[PDB]
Amino acid sequence: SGFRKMAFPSGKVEGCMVQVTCGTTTLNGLWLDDVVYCPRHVICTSEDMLNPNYEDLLIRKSNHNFLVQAGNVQLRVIGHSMQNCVLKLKVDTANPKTPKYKFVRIQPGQTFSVLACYNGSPSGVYQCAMRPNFTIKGSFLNGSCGSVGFNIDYDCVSFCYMHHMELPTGVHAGTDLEGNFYGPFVDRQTAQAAGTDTTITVNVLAWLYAAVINGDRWFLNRFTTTLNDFNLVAMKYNYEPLTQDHVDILGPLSAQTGIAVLDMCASLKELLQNGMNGRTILGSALLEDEFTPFDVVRQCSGVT
């Protein structure tokens, strides 16, 4: 037993991290096959960020202006293009460490592991979730743009995120590996306030089921509720509406503990209205929403 925010092993992804420099700007790039993916703002000078015209800026750039370095060996750039907000640098060498991969655009509420990088070097790995407002609460400094978010399906790396921006609230913005930002964020140095960050209700329910599996059962009561009654209380606390599909997704957790989904919703309603009263669940004093029901089932079974 035990419950932790566990990230996927980062080994396969580490073998893909490279350093991309353009002018005085160095950031991280994802080297897959003979392509290096990186946030297109690598071409901007700090003044250009204020109101950038990426196509105009990119006209002044040639292949030899992008320095790509995998460890300490320099890679030769033989082509460059812009796809949405990512530059794809075709190199003369295919990454021999390229794992089996996919580019996925994840749904809000889904989780992924981040391999935070500086100068093409992996520094740390941690778990994140795409918030319902399309921001992520990561840990990024200057030099971290180009860090990637990913999941692993046994041996296939599903890249879902690339870090590009820090927002005024301290949260982060990024794109899928096709250069499209999640949400309404643009790669411009302008204040882009995020929307209301709602709670991923299904994830909280999955983590309350993980808490039951672990031995923390103080919050379980003798009450039940209905989807409609639950959503009246969830809406008040900025919780995402609960659907029958969410109830079905919770199936293996509801069966494992023997506790009905609606019975757990009733316990969540009482935690929302009455608080934790100084108590904790899985060592947390608040309701955790960054474990999808898949993460909980995986951790409480034995998947690798």
Ligand X SMILES: COc1ccnc(NC(=O)Cc2ccc3ccccc3c2)c1
Q: Which residues are catalytic?
A: 41, 145
Q: Following DSSP, what letter does each residue of 55-120 receive, concatenated?
A: HHHHHT--GGGEEEEETTEEEPEEEEEEETTEEEEEESS--TTPPEEEE--PPTT-EEEEEEEETT
Scanning residues 117 to 156, which ones bind a second copy (CB under 8 A)?
Answer: 117-119, 121-126, 128, 137-143
Residue 129 engages ligand X in binding (rule: CB under 6 A): no
Within a 10 A sphere around the Cβ of 169, how many other Cβ atoms? 13
Alpha-carbon span 255 to 58, nearest angstrom = 55
Site for a second copy in 274-293 (CB under 8 A): 275-276, 278, 280, 283-286
Binding status of residue 220 toward ligand X by CB under 6 A:
no
Q: Residue 192's CB: how many other CB atoms inside 10 A?
A: 16
Q: Considering CB under 8 A, how many residues would be counted as binding a second copy?
A: 53
d(CA 73, CA 115): 21
| 8 part of the interface to a second copy, by CB under 8 A | yes
Q: In sequence order, which residues have a C-beta less than 8 Å from that of residue 211 and are 6 or more positions away?
A: 3, 217, 219, 281, 282
Q: Applying CB under 6 A, does 57 fall inside the site for ligand X?
A: no
CA distance 82 to 177: 12
Residue nearest to ligand X (CB): 189
* DSSP conformation letters of 229-244: HHHHHHHHTTBPPP-H
> 244: closest CA among 258, 255, 231?
231
Which of the choices a second copy, ligand X, none does residue 137 contact, using the CB cut-off of 5 to 8 A by kind? a second copy
Site for a second copy contains 170 (CB under 8 A): yes
Beta carbon of residue 140, minimum distance to a second copy (angstroms, whole number): 6
CB nearer to a second copy: give 218 or 223.
218
Residue 191 binds ligand X, judged by CB under 6 A: yes
Residue 123 interacting with ligand X (CB under 6 A): no
For residue 96, the partner it binds in ligand X, a second copy, none, with Cβ less than 5 to 8 A by kind, is none
Which one of 8-16, 48-56, 179-187, 261-269 is the stretch in contact with a second copy (CB under 8 A)? 8-16
Residue in the block written with tokens 């993916």: 37
11 binds a second copy (CB under 8 A): yes
Q: What is the DSSP string of 197-261?
A: --B-HHHHHHHHHHHHHHT--TT--S----HHHHHHHHHHTTBPPP-HHHHHHTHHHHHHH---H
Q: Which of 203, 206, 225, 215 is nearest to 270 (CA)?
A: 225
- Residue with smaller CB distance to a second copy, 17 or 87: 17
Nearer to a second copy, 83 or 127 (CB): 127
Name which of residues 161 to 180 contact ligand X (CB under 6 A): 165-168
Least distance to a second copy, CB of residue 22, Å: 19
Binding site for ligand X (CB under 6 A): 41, 49, 145, 165-168, 189, 191
Binding site for a second copy (CB under 8 A): 1-11, 14-15, 115-119, 121-126, 128, 137-143, 166, 170-172, 214-215, 275-276, 278, 280, 283-286, 298-304
